[PDB]
Amino acid sequence: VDFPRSRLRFKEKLGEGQFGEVHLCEVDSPQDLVSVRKGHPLLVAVKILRPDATKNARNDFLKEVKIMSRLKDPNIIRLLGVCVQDDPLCMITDYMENGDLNQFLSAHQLEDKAAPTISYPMLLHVAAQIASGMRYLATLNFVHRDLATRNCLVGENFTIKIADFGMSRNLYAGDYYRVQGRAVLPIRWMAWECILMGKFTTASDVWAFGVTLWEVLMLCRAQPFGQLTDEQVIENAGEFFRDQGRQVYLSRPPACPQGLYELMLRCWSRESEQRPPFSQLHRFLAEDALN
Numbered sequence: 709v710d711f712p713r714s715r716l717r718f719k720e721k722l723g724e725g726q727f728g729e730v731h732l733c734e735v736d737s738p739q740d741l742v743s744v745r746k747g748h749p750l751l752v753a754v755k756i757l758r759p760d761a762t763k764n765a766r767n768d769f770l771k772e773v774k775i776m777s778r779l780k781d782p783n784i785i786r787l788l789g790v791c792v793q794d795d796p797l798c799m800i801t802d803y804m805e806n807g808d809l810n811q812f813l814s815a816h817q818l819e820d821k822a823a824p825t826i827s828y829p830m831l832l833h834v835a836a837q838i839a840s841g842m843r844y845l846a847t848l849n850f851v852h853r854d855l856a857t858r859n860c861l862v863g864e865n866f867t868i869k870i871a872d873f874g875m876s877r878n879l880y881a882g883d884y885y886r887v888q889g890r891a892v893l894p895i896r897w898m899a900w901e902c903i904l905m906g907k908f909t910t911a912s913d914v915w916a917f918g919v920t921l922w923e924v925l926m927l928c929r930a931q932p933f934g935q936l937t938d939e940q941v942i943e944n945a946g947e948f949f950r951d952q953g954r955q956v957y958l959s960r961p962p963a964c965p966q967g968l969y970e971l972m973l974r975c976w977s978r979e980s981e982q983r984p985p986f987s988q989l990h991r992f993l994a995e996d997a998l999n
């Protein structure tokens with residue numbers, strides 16, 4: 709059943725896609741639709757395909773609706789509703805008022821105990837939620853392929869949801885490696901076997917989670933392998949394959965204790981089956997955040 713499109717009131721533009729836009733909207737007379745807090749503007753985000761969108765654009769949109777429709781977890785973007793029985797095609801999701809996690813964290817510093825900041829335990833809670841979302845995706849045998857902080861959204865009280873913006877945002881253009889006629893590739897987040905053979909699996913999602921964890925512990929203030937060129941990062945993948953002890957790893961963030969760094973290192977294991985499963989990554993971080 710279609711969400712009543714006429715109840716969607718535009719408020720501002722959140723994003724410019726290639727063929728679509730994402731808008732911030734209010735829902736008029738909110739509680740009439742509940743299958744919202746009293747006296748407050750119920751905001752949602754709406755992804756809308758332009759009425760003059762191509763056949764290809766419309767096809768990709770319809771497939772995204774199918775994919776989103778099954779994702780049902782507290783730390784994954786949720787499909788609240790659709791408007792697809794007529795044009796323009798719409799998808800609706802929760803408004804995450806603090807934007808993408810990379811921008812959010814970039815605007816924070818680790819609290820100095822000696823005295824906006826964020827605590828170490830809170831950093832772990834951020835990471836644990838990401839791991840919980842990926843744990844869910846793993847149980848569906850759903851491979852994300854582009855896990856990074858730029859692809860996570862942040863709501864109130866540091867709640868996190870995993871999304872998938874695509875690779876076209878100007879702000880993150882430097883995170884993607886482009887060759888004519890090939891797939892655009894987030895090489896700095898990619899397991900060696902992804903770079904060399906195009907093989908994306910849950911185990912390469914684990915590797916990307918390691919890099920994402922490294923980002924969180926760096927407070928998003930440096931790009932992974934930031935002093936190496938795209939070419940050297942690709943060459944590094946070659947060194948993982950060759951396995952002659954010449955491969956290199958991201959270094960330990962200042963905010964990251966050695967035990968936690970050793971867990972990161974395990975995510976970057978050459979052998980896929982030796983990378984920790986998400987159920988264990990979550991358990992580790994939630995124990996450490998709790999205690």
Ligand SMILES: CNC(=O)CN1CN(c2ccccc2)C2(CCN(C(=O)c3ccc4n[nH]cc4c3)CC2)C1=O
Nearest residue numbers: 722723730753754755785799800801803804871872873
């Ligand atoms: C798991 N796959 C996905 O999430 C794919 N999809 C689905 N999708 C979506 C967008 C609206 C309605 C329904 C679905 C997005 C969400 C993130 N995007 C935004 O532009 C954005 C930006 C700031 C926001 N603040 N609050 C919410 C925000 C949304 C890109 C499109 C996405 O990644």
